[PDB]
Design a protein around this ligand. Structure first.
Ligand code: CHL
Ligand code: CHL
Ligand code: CHL
Ligand code: CHL
Ligand code: CLA
Ligand code: CLA
Ligand code: CLA
Ligand code: CLA
Ligand code: CLA
Ligand SMILES: CC1=C[C@H](O)CC(C)(C)[C@H]1/C=C/C(C)=C/C=C/C(C)=C/C=C/C=C(C)/C=C/C=C(\C)CCC1=C(C)C[C@H](O)CC1(C)C
Lengths: 201, 225, 201, 202
């Protein structure tokens, strides 16, 4: 069996708890997983590198101050910024964020015409035409690789939901919570935190 | 050893005599309808499995509501803090929690329910039963069907199912199930809002009915505003 | 076109996110919308004219005393109560509103027969038999006015949801949150209040 | 039956194991006795919740000489029942009005006196179904089932009134007072502990 766990891939199955409904729901699922995966690994890396929890990283960069981000990146040869000048600013990045992500979005979904105009079809999660220069889509069992990615997608989203609920309850951070649990698993758990209260009880 | 294969001819210690239906011919005049007898009033019927899921959550929430009720009546400890008693450390306290108990789970001294001991027994018993109920493990009782919430063989030793009308009893259980689940939801929301047990909230609401309500505690912000 | 924004009205096509399901959902959407129109408009007007938050307005009338509600009307020529505080009462307002709203609801749905004795049909929204003393429904484009009503329904409900979550977070009031936003658009928003922790973090 | 699951049965539903149903006038008597009992048990329930006076002592508050005590007994009343300055619900006043109103209603219920209405209302029928049921709840509801509900309430409330009178005779404390004592500690407050005390006589 390809998918021995509880649920099954959309292509074949029944979706036991929630009905399958639209196929756009499956499109969203994959995209949510492909995103949350990047989010979870980014929160992991930010906690490991800087010790700053992900959920307050936005406090760092603000309209008045967005210079602190420059010195955070570990092992960089020169800063992010022009040193004292600190050209990077919240708005400086924001205009860049909105234009670049909006272009990437729209050329993905087909709100605007595809610039690549290379036969790629919008509304498919797996293009496999240009976004795989390495050819791992072409080679190997492509369907099995869709399965693995899906599994990683669902795991990462569930871990993301865990991360947000741990940020709400513990207020410490994902990796800080991981270190607390590993240092002592018996007396550092969700139920131990509930016994102590989540800061509200 | 030879094969005897005699006739047991044993009867149930108690076997309820036919009592039929004790309900009106109309069976769900309440909001909504039982599954397999009409259209769901509001929420869409997710799957055929959802009926059995409703039954299981219902029976579990019945048992949970009665447990919180009896625990608070017998000890005064709220159900949501009763977990803090039996822990890997100092699970001795959880023992003497039953009013009138001739003996303690923890005899005086070291003798005691260990959390891990209790836990290990809990996994080995409840998980086994949970699996045997569902398609996991196998079927130790072939005469019964795994995946059926109403087996009604060895699981009704008193034979109320066959003694009365089966389907009215089924809907009666379903109504009790939905009532207890909604009551359980009320209990968790009350625990969140007031930080006091269900019977404590009941007593506060009956001593002075006009105050000690949702909106009275909301006037204080549920202790958060 | 008719519905250029995201999504569509019940007859326009398939729902993007949640499948349409039962036909009664459209009726619930309209009724909820109309109630949210009333709710948002009341929350605005009460906060603008008086200044009390709508969420704490519940505590202001209580069976211990419901005279603070009296005379708290902008430009009120006629007092709500006599000079006597005793005549106005929380249960006096409650009993009449229970009987009036219960009658209105039962007549709208058909639990009890229509006293109006008009062509207005139960299990139906905006019959228009008598609810529109002015015939601009039929004189104007009835379908255009219906889609406009529905767009306002969805806007008012989404705004009410935002209002309740702002009350839970900011605890200052919807209109008061508006005032704070315009007073300082960049230092007063969600992200700034999240940096403050919504009063809990 | 399917509908009636109580120990006994309703007249016309079948036959009772003890004292089986005889004349239909007995069934009329049962329903009317029930109806007055529902009213009576509810009155004995609500009055001493409002002001604390057991129903078996509430009679003497109004007397031919003085009946001021019954005035202003109802909780929540905006004003006195009759002028605060000089309450005028005298026992004779109560009597003279009530005997005429109750006698009229009774004779008009049973038709010994010519009916005022003559709206098709047929006496000797427990369910008149006329002006008495303006809501016409019976019309929407299922009349057989509703008759069974009425008789179940009839028998329950008549039994409750029997309980009220015998509790008065044993404990002379009051119905809700007996309730509150029993809820306080049922194990040490019930019929058998009052028997151990001797019911106040032994
Ligand atoms: C689009 C995706 C995206 C998401 C999911 C978040 C999510 C977050 N940001 Mg970030 N941001 C995002 C994009 C961006 N942020 C910023 C700049 C900031 C700032 C400046 C701040 C945040 C803050 C926050 C937090 C607010 C918590 C909240 O609203 O209550 C919880 C809400 C939910 C659970 C709703 C679901 C949260 C971790 C704030 C923060 O750190 O608060 C402590 C903060 O001050 N973000 C920029 C630059 C323009 C972004 C660009 O796309
Ligand atoms: C044999 C004497 C003995 C007596 C008189 C009682 C008496 C009582 N127990 Mg206890 N218990 C006794 C032995 C035991 N109890 C328990 C475990 C429990 C539980 C689990 C519960 C009681 C409950 C109750 C009450 C139920 C009243 C009725 O119904 C009452 C105060 C019930 C209670 O607390 O109701 C509020 C209840 O739920 N008892 C155990 C272990 C199996 C016992 C073993 O000897
Ligand atoms: C039917 C619509 C309706 C709605 C949605 C509300 C909603 C509210 N009322 Mg109001 N009320 C409503 C009708 C009425 N109220 C009152 C009388 C009161 C009083 C006396 C009080 C409220 C309070 C409240 C708040 C309590 C929040 C809560 O329970 O915890 C949160 C629950 C949720 C978010 C639900 C999910 C909230 C703003 C209380 C308040 O203001 O406390 C702050 C309060 O004390 N209401 C009357 C009688 C005239 C009503 C008649 O229909
Ligand atoms: C502002 C007017 C007003 C208010 C708020 C009340 C309120 C009350 N009355 Mg009163 N009454 C009022 C006027 C009157 N009452 C009565 C006659 C009664 C009776 C007969 C009863 C009450 C009862 C009650 C209580 C209902 C509790 C439950 O339900 C409550 C204290 C009931 C009670 O005692 O419940 C405890 C009850 O049975 N009231 C009369 C007619 C004389 C009134 C005339 O205006
Ligand atoms: C005054 C009230 C009253 C009346 C007229 C009836 C009349 C009737 N009932 Mg109903 N019933 C009553 C009260 C009444 N019942 C109560 C309180 C209960 C609950 C316990 C029932 C329960 C009941 C059942 C369960 C059944 C009936 C049935 C019947 C019928 C059978 C014939 C019969 O017994 O009539 C004669 C009426 C009597 C009341 C019997 C007399 C009882 C004796 C005298 C004991 C009472 C002691 C008394 C209260 C002492 C008070 C002393 C105190 C003042 C100090 C008849 C229509 C049966 C029926 O219709 O079957 C088809 C049936 O199955 N009834
Ligand atoms: C938002 C992301 C997302 C999306 C769009 C989907 C969509 C889908 N999944 Mg995927 N999945 C997700 C999350 C998601 N899932 C996660 C996190 C897990 C790990 C538990 C899975 C695990 C999973 C399995 C194992 C299976 C699916 C299946 C399916 C399909 C059936 C359900 C459906 O159509 O309704 C989609 C409806 C929703 C996504 C709404 C969910 C609503 C609940 C209430 C969410 C609860 C968490 C919520 C975010 C909490 C709020 C937090 C907030 C307070 C901050 C569909 C294609 C099944 C399938 O393909 O069948 C063939 C299948 O077998 N998925
Ligand atoms: C988890 C328990 C549970 C389950 C599995 C079901 C399942 C079912 N019910 Mg039951 N029911 C329940 C709870 C539940 N119900 C409760 C508590 C009530 C009383 C209010 C009812 C009352 C009821 C009636 C009156 C009817 C049903 C019907 C049905 C069926 C159709 C609905 C469906 O498939 O979608 C199930 C979808 C859901 C359960 C999702 C709803 C989720 C909401 C948001 C509630 C979440 C609760 C809570 C806020 C979570 C807190 C989280 C915590 C972290 C704070 C199905 C068998 C109908 C039927 O049989 O149709 C023929 C019918 O007529 N049920
Ligand atoms: C309770 C109000 C309500 C109701 C009954 C409906 C019902 C409907 N809408 Mg409308 N809609 C609403 C709110 C509502 N919508 C709001 C606020 C918006 C603006 C965001 C819209 C925007 C909208 C669009 C754009 C479209 C619809 C469509 C539809 C249909 C699709 C079926 C559906 O939604 O399932 C019934 C509803 C549910 C199952 C909703 C469950 C709740 C969801 C998952 C999350 C909401 C969060 C919740 C408020 C959190 C509360 C927490 C708080 C208590 C603390 C149906 C007629 C579609 C349509 O007509 O297609 C033909 C369509 O295209 N609606
Ligand atoms: C802005 C929101 C909005 C919109 C666009 C509509 C639009 C419509 N409604 Mg709906 N309706 C709404 C809000 C809305 N309604 C609310 C909040 C309620 C609850 C009271 C209703 C209750 C309702 C019923 C019961 C019926 C309609 C009907 C109609 C149609 C008739 C034409 C009409 O009302 O002109 C819309 C005109 C305007 C939006 C102009 C502005 C009017 C403003 C708000 C001031 C109104 C002042 C008013 C005269 C007096 C009240 C003041 C108080 C102090 C049309 C589809 C009828 C129908 O469709 O039958 C075929 C019908 O039967 N509506
Ligand atoms: C409200 C109020 C407030 C003031 O403060 C004081 C106040 C006194 C003015 C007071 C006024 C109250 C009023 C007006 C009350 C009216 C009461 C009425 C009509 C009572 C009738 C009571 C009827 C009884 C017991 C029946 C017993 C019959 C029994 C068991 C037999 C049962 C029987 C049967 C038939 C057949 C089966 O097969 C089986 C068995 C054998 C069980």
């Amino acid at each position: 069996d390809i998918y021995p766990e509880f649920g099954t891939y959309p292509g074949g199955g029944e979706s036991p708890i929630i009905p399958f409904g639209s196929e756009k729901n499956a499109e969203r699922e994959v995209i949510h997983g492909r995103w949350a995966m990047l989010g979870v690994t980014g929160a992991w890396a930010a906690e490991n590198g800087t010790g700053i929890p992900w959920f307050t990283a936005g406090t760092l960069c603000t309209p008045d101050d967005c210079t602190a981000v420059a010195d955070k990146f570990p092992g960089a040869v020169a800063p992010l910024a022009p040193e004292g000048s600190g050209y990077p600013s919240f708005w400086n990045v924001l205009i860049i964020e909105i234009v670049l992500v909006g272009a990437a979005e729209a050329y993905r979904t087909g709100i605007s015409d595809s610039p690549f105009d290379d036969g790629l079809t919008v509304g498919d999660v797996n293009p496999g035409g240009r976004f795989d220069p390495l050819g791992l889509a072409e080679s190997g069992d492509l369907e099995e690789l869709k399965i693995k990615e899906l599994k990683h997608c669902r795991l990462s989203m569930f871990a993301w939901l865990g991360c947000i609920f741990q940020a709400l309850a513990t207020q410490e951070g994902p990796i800080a919570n991981w270190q607390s649990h590993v240092a002592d698993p018996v007396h550092s758990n969700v139920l131990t935190n509930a016994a102590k209260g989540f800061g509200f009880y | 050893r030879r094969t005897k294969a005699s006739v047991p001819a044993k009867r149930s210690a108690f076997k309820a005599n036919k009592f039929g239906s004790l309900a009106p011919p109309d069976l769900y005049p309440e909001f909504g309808t039982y599954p397999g007898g009409g259209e769901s009033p509001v929420i869409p019927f997710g799957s055929e499995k959802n009926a059995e899921r409703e039954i299981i959550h219902g029976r579990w929430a019945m048992l949970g509501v009665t447990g919180a009720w009896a625990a608070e009546n017998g000890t005064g400890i709220p159900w949501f803090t009763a977990g803090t008693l039996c822990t890997p450390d100092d699970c001795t306290a959880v023992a003497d929690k039953f009013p009138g108990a001739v003996a303690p789970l923890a005899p005086a001294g070291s003798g005691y329910p260990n959390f891990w001991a209790v836990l290990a027994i809990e996994i080995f018993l409840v998980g086994s039963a949970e699996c045997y109920r569902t398609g996991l493990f196998e079927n130790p009782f072939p005469e019964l069907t795994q995946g059926d919430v109403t087996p009604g063989g060895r699981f009704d030793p008193l034979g109320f199912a066959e003694a009365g009308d089966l389907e009215e009893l089924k809907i009666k259980e379903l109504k009790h199930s939905r009532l207890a689940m909604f009551a359980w939801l009320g209990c968790i929301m009350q625990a969140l809002a007031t930080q006091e047990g269900p019977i404590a909230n009941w007593t506060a609401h009956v001593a002075d009915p006009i105050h000690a309500n949702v909106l009275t505690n909301a006037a204080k912000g549920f202790k958060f505003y």
